[PDB]
Design a protein around this ligand. Structure first.
Ligand SMILES: [Mg+2]
Ligand SMILES: [Zn+2]
Ligand SMILES: [Zn+2]
Ligand SMILES: [Zn+2]
Ligand SMILES: [Zn+2]
Lengths: 1131, 67, 206, 404, 115, 51, 46
């Protein structure tokens, strides 16, 4: 029955494999989008108010149902056809499906003359579709079906195709809503502040933040204030309580202080009462609120109405926005004050801003919902204006012409295309970085980009606290994978078994709590709240309970049985403070864990047995979760959980550590993400090395996707001979690194050989490189289109001619065909022409606008595709193919942060060799190891020697006590090798033995995208910028290198004044001006007629020539634009 | 994508051994014994056969450009 | 029409070993040939023409490299070891090419390297102490060692010099191993002879 | 040309070079001139500027050329020195038991540019002619400079007792009349510190002679290292069973000591020291215990090393690494700190959900009792990732403020 | 972009001499032989054969740059001898050694195939 | 204070133990792109005509 | 002169002249590919 330790390493990984058979790696994206389409769009459409318009006749126009068909495309003839994602990629279409809404317009004029007209399936917009979602044509297709459609079966999906560009929505971090968080700002007028970003269940407005603060000590005592929304002045809490109908001080403290035996709380609230005694009735308090507001009505009536509306709608919407909710709002605001007092009295800890239990991940669904709310509101507005301008004339109108569908369509398309998350007009208030271009450089880069999280703290911020790896990231975020540049700690990555909750309605839970012995908050007396336990659901205090323990037992049983409580519902019992917080909302990152009985796992051997035959008896992960054996625990419920790292922790020990565990890790290696799960032995490296590899696995070459032959990507690198690593971890089985690997096993020798590998460099074998070692192919796609925008000027693909075309370069166009397009198989060098495009003029009647190769490439045309774009003019894509043979300067890396460029390449006779004539493919310098402490590199090399000599794949899973260095060495000594991986090598040049026995063996190396040929650049009098006549910027522009301020300072320190003048004047922008010797302002010179005159001074004899930079002339002219007179006085 | 022709290290021909290697593996050989049957004694050539991923078999799941 | 681009196929064809035993001495380098781009005195013509019409995958192997010279053929195609795989083709895919093989050696490209490993060793027992084992007991014995198992390395020979070099020259297939050794000795001797000729011209010109 | 690397921090980040046209597509640099640029070859790119007049060319040739840039005015010492392979190898080369044969010596003399063509009389004539590494470095050393240094492993109690001028360990570098009379050369003798051989060469001999000195050290020593070789592997990370038992006993004793301090604090048997609160005093005691454990285990690992250990070779020469790195690879990685304190209670009174609440023990709060060869446990792995994230954040955040 | 053709390691450029002899002025009876388009293969054997001559006082070689394709062999002999004569005799001795080795390898192959 | 300049080049750096400290190894393509305006004289008339 | 293209979906060789919408005559598919040139490109098998 029990899984014994000897079977555990199989059982756990069997369980893990079942998880990845059920979910995958992009499950969060697909589930978010599915919830958005199934629920969020319908909720948004129904939550909009019916637009009642009347001059008389009236019309309501109620939207009642939505229909999202499959993705289709409409040609110029208008025939709807099912559009495949690959066709969208090739034709630069948007993989979107039409959204139709049912509309009901009832005519009501007078005399009960009512009649309803329903417009079924009114086309309301087009919604882009996430690939492999339920509403994707690739849904449920087999691998054969996907290959029939020219799709990769290993492609995870989880992205959109907008204008042929694959866009991926990055999950955005945000502070959780409807939760009270008591912080303390050191530099502020308030000692303590308790904030609550409140938002109603079905979002319709932004988060309304309410603060309840305490004024810092230094009138008599500490005063509690409340910064309500839409009010620009602090308001005493007692005033707010009275404005809600609680005038008696006893009632207010009944709502705030639940234990009247506690004078400390009492004296700390007393200043607030003493400050609010002149105001003693609800109307006066409402008038005070309205007066403190930023729109103080001259008459107290409208002041009181405004205060009523604010306290009913903007104050704590999550508690309830309807009327008669003042009791719930009073209880909740009293809870906020109670929490603030507990913090000020030291009875509760301040809340941690960085705790991921306090955060939420805004995924594709809830982000598209924000867009859709804004866009549907704008659409209903436009419909209101259109219908109003017609009914004002007293006649009917056609809603089909009122609905301008471009709002929703173009809005979603623009937002996903650019990443600016918001309305196109508010292009600066909008937050960019959402919806990035999917990284297709290697399969690991694609997976990681699809599992990418973002902390929008702002890269400019230099506070390290949000960048720090918090304790609560354990199991939810990769500890290693993070960019090492300016976004350290802000851009994160999901751990492998991390699941972001999609969201759920609290209705069944609330109903069960009602049927259960919970007492509502309006029905109780406050005297009961002392000993009772509060119950919050999605931040709303809904009631109280008397035995929280057996309530938690009941709820956990219900969630483990897949009863009314769904698996993703978090249920935290804080014991010391008697809250029970239940969460069903979306964005809660959680992970699966094995539940533990008294001191035993519930995962018995029968579950492993049924999981082994997963493909026959359809016993899956969901059956494991439904059995009550596995549980999803979120960051906030982990605080109440006692984990076992392994079932070995559940053994009874000579001194028991815990003996009351509640859960167990499925495997600790699941704390790593996609790119860190490729590192072998990451627990033997320094952690920065693991981070650098997690970044560098994403630039590694491989086969980024199986269907690369049909993709017209702008840039693509494919390795000739990718190999799976000889030394692998058990997590790559689910990353599909074995099916799409990104490196080669290289016989690497760590040695000092000729000095060409010093300081992070490598010596490669020229003979191996000749045999296809780390050879790659680079595919570059050029796009072009001939626009017939108007009869004024039209472009067209056609072989240009020297007699008709004007802007025709001296390059030869013979490689083009009569259609103007080069043919596949044609070898093209730099500056060559691949598309001959000519544009009609207003060298006559047509000008050359041909597409050249990006300079200095020298490839062969791989293929040419011709089609029609969305509007329907001819559209061409040409993929050119360039074989990249590794060379000096190309960057290579192992899986341990050990990067370096090729210093030199030696032939096989020049490389050092073992007694059996094995030469290293790569030689790396021993000095790269000691400071870096990448012992995982050495253990991987030794394990790889054992694996190659044994005919197996080494197990480098991080935390594995069945694999240590002594075992690997003992294994290697059985194959006739030195147990530590050393060998006697001979000098290739002289054949003499090397005195020091070299450490050599197979290690998995990666070829990175950074090849020297894509970086080398030179300039000598090339093109210049228009504004300031200085060299351009970039290799692509044939630009010059920037001689910056620091270079100026260095050369000033050198004392090299002529070199400094050459760099900053003569090699950048030499220029001449003519200055009036009297006024010092630039004069008018006419060198052809030799007439120089200053219009200002009315002189034409006292002019002087001045040699100045063009940028300085431009500066002085831009100062004269500002009415400044910079007078260059030559005397 | 396809089995290399030569071993990158020594230059021994491994191109003619992939199919035989697979046939030995379905014959219930261990990978080590299979590599021994094909005469790959240096761990470089054993690396070549043992770490190869036949991606061409997946690229042949797509219909060609011309019928 | 195969799934491997043209340079992939070309590189792959270059690495197929061709029987070179008696023909390599007769052929000339295209540098030295007085012909045009090609001729039968400096090159060998190969042709390959395969089309997958049937439903099973067609293995385009080195057996499909048809030569004009019967003496220079792919080693695997020589009259066991299977044929080197050039490319796998799917129904409707087709590969038709025309290759020319030339005379060269491994300095120019590893495809002209005739060896599949050259094991070279000397002083199997570390008597000259050209290696210094920190722990001589930990190291396995050479196949050429003559030491009793208790003895880890030979006693140090102060008056010793490297003699008795052991070789294991493995052939890729193009040449016989003994032909590799004989051709190596002849090539080294002709390098020295040419060097001496140029030396004599330099000495007499001074 | 002026050769530059960004960020251009000081005047040595832009130096004058003479162009040497070579086949492939990278900028090829000497390895001594990498420290001034702060340049390594992990994908770094550098900028070449070509002066376009005889006046600017003369300016760069007389002011900014690299040999004129050997000594920096910032700290009146060399800015470039001997570096990784050449430094490990010159340390191994100038050991007392390095004996070169006639053919090896001629091979090395082929790579001396400043060689008068006279083979020096070997240090050993019989039974077999043998030159020493010091005897060839004496040929590399220019002019008649005189220099006294001490190898990094020089015992501090040797200059007092006898054998001061005849060092048993071949420490106490002594160069006289441009001959390395004795001593093992290392970072202290050929690095960028003040009073080293490269500095004294620049001060006594010109910048041209010093340029040749750098080049000759590098060429001769690299071509000798082709014979000697240098490596590193698992065998250098391993220690003997006695060392492992000593380290584990040290760690066990340290954990029991921390348990005793915890028990004292729990029983109110701990009184605070002046200037600190009780929490801070407890933290000081625990951190002192664990730092003592780390240092003792590191000393155990360091003494366990042999003379053939390659970590010890690179640390001794000063080429790369430190004794703390050896301790972390062999003995114990040690305490992980976030903001200068132990791992914070990021959960509620816990560092991770795997620990009990209020657990101030060493493993709970981020003491990695394993080495990098042993491998970190999952909690040690996460805490080490936290500590390393602190360094990454510091490196990425200090740059803007320091540049401003 | 910058890859030299692989034949440039073996082939002489037009007007480039295979070997050049330059008198070394530092010491008497010394010469520098700059040999183009050769490498360690001939340099090592020529040096080691020259070391077998008791009339040779110095014999060394270097490849000044691996990316370049020449070697320099420095030979110093006793005053009654010449470095050019020493170099010639070294090449003659290497040729005779290789001829003998080739004939003996042919004999050994014949014995092995026969019995 | 800082600006783009002509006669500049940039590429990856690489080790070269066989250069002196004051030398820089330059590709032939960078050197073929970059030029130095040398004045003609009877001292260099022949060499510059050759170039 | 003919510029025959191949269909991305039906793989049909069909001729299309300039100023013609890009449509396969056999199945109407909108994506077409050019055929391999007849020019003679040479590869050094290296
Ligand atoms: Mg760098
Ligand atoms: Zn004027
Ligand atoms: Zn091999
Ligand atoms: Zn010919
Ligand atoms: Zn068609």
């Amino acid at each position: 029955d029990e899984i014994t330790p000897d079977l555990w390493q199989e059982a756990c990984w069997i369980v893990i494999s079942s998880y990845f058979d059920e979910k995958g790696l992009v499950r969060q994206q697909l589930d978010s989008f599915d919830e958005f389409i199934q629920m969020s769009v319908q909720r948004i459409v129904e939550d909009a108010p019916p637009i009642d318009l009347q001059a008389p006749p009236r019309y309501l126009l109620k939207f009642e149902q939505i229909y999202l068909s499959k993705p289709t495309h409409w040609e110029r003839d208008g025939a709807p056809s099912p559009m495949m994602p690959n066709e969208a990629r090739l034709r630069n279409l948007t993989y979107s499906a039409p959204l139709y809404v049912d509309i009901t317009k009832t005519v009501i004029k007078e005399g009960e003359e009512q009649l309803q007209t329903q417009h079924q399936k009114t086309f309301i917009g087009k919604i882009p579709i996430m690939l492999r979602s339920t509403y994707c044509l690739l849904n449920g297709l087999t691998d054969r079906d996907l290959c029939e459609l020219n799709e990769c079966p290993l492609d995870p999906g989880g992205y959109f195709i907008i204008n042929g560009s694959e866009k991926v929505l990055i999950a955005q971090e945000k502070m959780a809503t409807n939760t009270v968080y008591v912080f303390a700002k050191k530099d502020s007028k308030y000692a303590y502040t308790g904030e609550c970003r409140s938002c109603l269940e079905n979002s319709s407005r932004p988060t309304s933040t309410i603060w309840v603060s305490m004024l810092a000590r230094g009138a008599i005592g500490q005063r509690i204030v409340a910064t309500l929304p839409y009010i620009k002045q602090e308001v005493p809490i007692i005033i707010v309580f009275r404005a809600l109908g609680f005038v008696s001080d006893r009632d207010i403290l009944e709502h705030i202080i639940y234990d009247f035996e506690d004078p400390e709380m009492m004296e700390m609230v007393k200043p607030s009462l003493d400050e609010a005694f002149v105001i003693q009735e609800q109307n006066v308090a409402l008038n005070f609120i309205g007066s403190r507001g930023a729109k103080p009505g001259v008459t107290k009536e409208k002041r009181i109405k405004y205060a009523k509306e604010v306290l009913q709608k903007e104050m704590l919407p999550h508690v309830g926005v309807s009327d008669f909710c003042e009791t719930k709002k009073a209880y909740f605001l009293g809870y906020m004050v109670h929490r603030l007092l507990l913090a000020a009295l030291g009875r509760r800890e301040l809340d941690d801003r960085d705790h991921y239990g306090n955060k939420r991940l805004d995924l594709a669904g809830p982000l598209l919902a924000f867009l859709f709310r804004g866009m549907f509101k704008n659409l209903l507005k436009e419909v209101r204006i259109y219908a109003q301008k017609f009914i004002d004339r007293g006649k009917d109108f056609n809603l089909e012409l009122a609905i301008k569908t471009r709002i929703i369509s173009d809005g979603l398309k623009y937002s996903l295309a650019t990443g600016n998350w918001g309305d196109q007009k508010k292009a600066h208030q909008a937050r960019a970085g959402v919806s990035q271009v999917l990284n297709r450089l290697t399969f690991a880069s694609t997976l990681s980009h699809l599992r990418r999280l973002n902390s929008p703290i702002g890269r400019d911020g230099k506070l390290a606290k949000p960048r720090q790896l918090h304790n609560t990231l354990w199991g939810m975020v990769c500890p290693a994978e993070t960019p090492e540049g300016h976004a350290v700690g802000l851009v994160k990555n999901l751990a492998l078994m991390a699941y972001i909750s999609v969201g759920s309605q609290p209705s069944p839970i609330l109903e069960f709590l009602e049927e259960w012995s919970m007492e509502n908050l309006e029905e109780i007396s406050p005297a009961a709240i002392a000993d009772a336990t509060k119950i919050f659901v999605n931040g709303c205090w809904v009631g109280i309970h008397k035995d929280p323990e057996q309530l938690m037992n009941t709820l956990r049983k219900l969630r483990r049985q897949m009863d009314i409580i769904v698996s993703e519902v978090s249920m935290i019992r804080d014991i010391r403070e008697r809250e029970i917080r239940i969460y069903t909302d979306a964005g809660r990152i959680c992970r699966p864990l094995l539940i533990v009985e008294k001191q035993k796992l519930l995962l018995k051997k029968r579950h492993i047995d049924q999981l082994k035959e997963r493909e026959y008896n359809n016993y899956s992960w969901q059956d494991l979760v439904a059995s009550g054996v596995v549980e999803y625990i979120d960051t906030l419920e982990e605080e109440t959980v006692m984990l076992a790292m392994t079932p070995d922790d559940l053994q009874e020990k000579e001194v028991a550590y815990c003996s009351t565990y509640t859960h167990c890790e499925i495997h600790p290696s699941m704390i790593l993400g996609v790119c860190a799960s490729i590192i072998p032995f990451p627990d033997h490296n320094q952690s920065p090395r693991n981070t650098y590899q997690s970044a560098m696995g994403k630039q590694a070459m491989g086969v980024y996707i199986t269907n690369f032959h049909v993709r017209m990507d702008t840039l693509a690198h494919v390795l000739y001979y990718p190999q799976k690593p000889l030394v692998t971890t058990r997590s790559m089985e689910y990353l599909r690194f074995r099916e799409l690997p990104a490196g080669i096993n290289s016989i690497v020798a760590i040695a000092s050989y000729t000095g060409y590998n010093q300081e992070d460099s490598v010596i490669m074998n020229r003979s191996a490189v000749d045999r296809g070692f780390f050879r790659s192919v680079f595919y570059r796609s050029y796009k072009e289109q001939e626009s017939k925008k108007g009869f004024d000027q039209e472009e067209v693909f056609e072989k240009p001619t020297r007699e008709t075309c004007q802007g025709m370069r001296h390059a030869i166009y013979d490689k083009l065909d009569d259609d103007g397009l080069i043919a596949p198989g044609v070898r093209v060098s730099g500056d060559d022409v691949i598309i001959g495009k000519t544009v009609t003029l207003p060298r006559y009647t047509k000008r050359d606008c041909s597409t050249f190769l990006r300079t200095s490439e020298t490839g062969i045309v791989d293929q040419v595709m011709v089609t029609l774009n969305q509007e329907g003019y001819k559209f061409c894509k040409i993929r050119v193919r360039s074989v990249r043979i590794p060379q000096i300067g190309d960057k290579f890396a192992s899986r341990h942060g050990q990067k370096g460029t090729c210093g030199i390449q030696y032939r096989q006779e020049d490389m050092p060799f073992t007694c059996e004539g094995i030469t290293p493919d790569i030689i790396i310098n021993p000095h790269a190891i000691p400071s870096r402490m990448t012992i995982g590199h050495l253990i991987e090399c030794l394990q790889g020697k054992v694996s190659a000599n044994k005919g197996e794949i080494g197990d480098a899973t991080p935390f594995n006590d069945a694999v240590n260095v002594q075992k690997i060495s003992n294994l290697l000594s059985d194959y006739g090798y030195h147990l530590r991986g050393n060998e006697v090598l001979y000098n290739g040049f002289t054949g003499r033995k090397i005195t020091s026995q070299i450490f050599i063996g197979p290690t998995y190396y990666q070829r990175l995208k950074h090849m020297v040929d894509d970086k080398i650049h030179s300039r000598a009098r090339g093109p210049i910028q228009i504004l300031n006549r200085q060299p351009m910027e970039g290799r692509s522009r044939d630009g010059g290198l920037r001689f910056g301020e620091m270079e100026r300072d260095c050369q000033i320190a050198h004392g090299a004044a002529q070199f400094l003048r050459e760099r900053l004047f003569e090699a950048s922008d030499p220029y001449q001006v003519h200055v009036c010797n009297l006024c010092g302002i630039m004069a008018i010179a006419n060198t052809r007629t030799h007439t120089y005159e200053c219009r200002g001074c009315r002189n034409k004899t006292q002019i002087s020539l001045v040699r100045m930079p063009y940028a300085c002339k431009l500066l002085f002219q831009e100062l004269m634009s500002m009415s400044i007179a910079p007078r260059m006085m030559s005397v | 994508m396809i089995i290399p022709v030569r071993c990158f290290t020594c230059g021994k021909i491994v191109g003619n051994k992939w199919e035989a290697y697979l046939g030995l593996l379905q014959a219930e050989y261990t990978e080590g014994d299979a590599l021994d049957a094909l005469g790959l004694k240096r761990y470089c050539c054993r690396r070549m056969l043992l770490a190869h991923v036949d991606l061409i078999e997946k690229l042949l799941n797509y219909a060609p450009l011309e019928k | 029409s195969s799934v491997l681009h043209d340079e992939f196929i070309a590189h792959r064809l270059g690495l197929i070993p061709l029987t070179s035993d008696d023909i390599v001495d007769k052929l000339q380098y295209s540098r030295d040939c007085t012909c045009e781009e090609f001729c039968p005195e400096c090159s060998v013509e190969f042709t390959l023409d395969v089309r997958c019409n049937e439903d099973q995958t067609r293995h385009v192997t080195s057996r499909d490299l048809i030569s004009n010279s019967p003496r220079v053929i792919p080693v695997t195609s020589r009259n066991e070891q299977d044929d080197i795989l050039i490319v796998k083709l799917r129904k409707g895919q087709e590969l038709r090419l025309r290759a020319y093989a030339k005379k060269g050696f491994g300095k120019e490209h590893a495809k002209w390297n005739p060896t599949a490993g050259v094991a070279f060793e000397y002083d199997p027992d570390n008597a000259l102490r050209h290696t210094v084992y920190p722990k001589p007991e930990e190291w396995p014995k050479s196949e050429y060692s003559e030491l009793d198992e208790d003895e880890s390395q030979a006693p140090y020979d102060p008056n010793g010099k490297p003699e008795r070099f052991y070789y294991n020259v493995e052939s890729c297939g193009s040449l016989r191993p003994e032909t590799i050794v004989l051709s190596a000795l002849s090539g080294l001797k002709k390098k020295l002879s040419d060097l001496q000729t140029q030396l004599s011209h330099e000495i007499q010109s001074d | 040309v002026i050769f530059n690397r960004q960020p251009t921090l000081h005047k040595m980040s832009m130096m004058g070079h003479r162009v040497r046209i070579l086949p492939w597509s990278t900028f090829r640099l000497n390895l001594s001139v990498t420290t001034p640029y702060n340049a390594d070859f992990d994908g770094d790119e550098m900028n070449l500027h070509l002066p376009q007049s005889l006046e600017t060319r003369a300016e760069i040739q007389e002011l900014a050329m690299v040999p004129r840039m050997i000594v920096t005015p910032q700290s009146n010492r060399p800015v470039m020195g001997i570096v990784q392979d050449t430094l490990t190898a010159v340390r191994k080369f100038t050991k007392r038991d390095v004996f070169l044969e006639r053919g090896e010596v001629m091979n090395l003399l082929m790579f001396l540019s400043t060689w008068d063509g006279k083979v020096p009389q070997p240090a050993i004539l019989k039974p077999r002619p043998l030159w020493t590494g010091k005897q060839i470095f004496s040929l590399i050393i220019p002019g008649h400079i005189n220099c006294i240094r001490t190898h990094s492993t020089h015992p501090d109690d040797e200059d007092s007792g006898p054998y001061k001028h005849i060092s048993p360990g071949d420490t106490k570098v002594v160069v006289e009349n441009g001959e390395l009379i004795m001593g093992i050369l290392c970072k202290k003798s050929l690095g960028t510190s003040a009073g080293s051989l490269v500095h004294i060469s620049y001060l006594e001999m010109g910048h041209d002679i010093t340029r040749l000195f750098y080049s000759n050290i590098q060429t001769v020593i690299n071509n000798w290292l082709l014979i000697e070789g240098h490596t590193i592997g698992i065998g250098d990370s391993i220690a003997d069973s006695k060392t492992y038992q000593d380290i584990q006993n040290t760690i066990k004793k340290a954990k029991q000591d921390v348990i005793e301090v915890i028990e004292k604090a729990h029983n109110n048997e701990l009184e605070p020291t002046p200037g600190n609160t009780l929490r801070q005093t407890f933290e000081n005691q625990v951190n002192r215990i664990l730092n003592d454990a780390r240092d003792k285990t590191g000393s155990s690992a360091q003494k366990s090393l042999s003379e053939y250990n390659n970590f010890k070779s690179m640390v001794v020469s000063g080429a790369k690494g430190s004794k703390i790195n050896i301790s972390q690879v062999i003995a114990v990685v040690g305490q992980q700190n976030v903001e200068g304190k132990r791992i914070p209670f990021g959960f509620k009174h816990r560092t991770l959900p795997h620990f009990i609440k209020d657990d101030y023990g060493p493993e709970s709060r981020g003491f990695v009792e394993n080495s990098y060869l042993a491998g970190l446990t999952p909690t040690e792995f996460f805490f080490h990732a936290m500590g390393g994230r602190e360094g990454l954040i510091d490196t990425a955040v200090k740059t803007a403020e320091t540049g401003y | 972009m910058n890859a030299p053709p692989a034949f440039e390691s073996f082939l002489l450029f037009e007007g480039e001499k295979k070997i050049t002899i330059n008198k070394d002025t530092k010491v008497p009876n010394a010469c520098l032989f700059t040999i183009n388009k050769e490498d360690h293969t001939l340099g090592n054997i020529i040096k080691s054969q020259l070391l077998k001559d008791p009339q040779v006082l110095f014999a060394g070689y270097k490849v000044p740059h691996p990316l370049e394709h020449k070697i320099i062999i420095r030979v110093q002999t006793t005053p009654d001898y010449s470095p050019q004569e020493a170099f010639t005799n070294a090449i003659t001795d290497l040729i005779s050694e290789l001829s003998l080795l080739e004939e003996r390898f042919r004999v050994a192959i014949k014995d092995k195939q026969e019995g | 204070m800082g600006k783009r300049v002509d006669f500049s080049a940039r590429t990856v750096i690489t080790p070269d133990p066989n250069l002196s400290i004051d030398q820089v190894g330059v590709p032939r393509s960078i050197a073929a792109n970059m030029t130095f305006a040398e004045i003609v004289t009877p001292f260099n008339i022949d060499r510059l005509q050759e170039l | 002169q003919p510029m025959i293209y191949i269909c991305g979906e039906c793989h049909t060789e069909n001729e299309i002249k300039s100023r013609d919408p890009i449509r396969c005559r056999e199945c109407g598919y909108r994506i077409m590919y050019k055929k391999r040139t007849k020019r003679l490109v040479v590869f050094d098998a290296r």
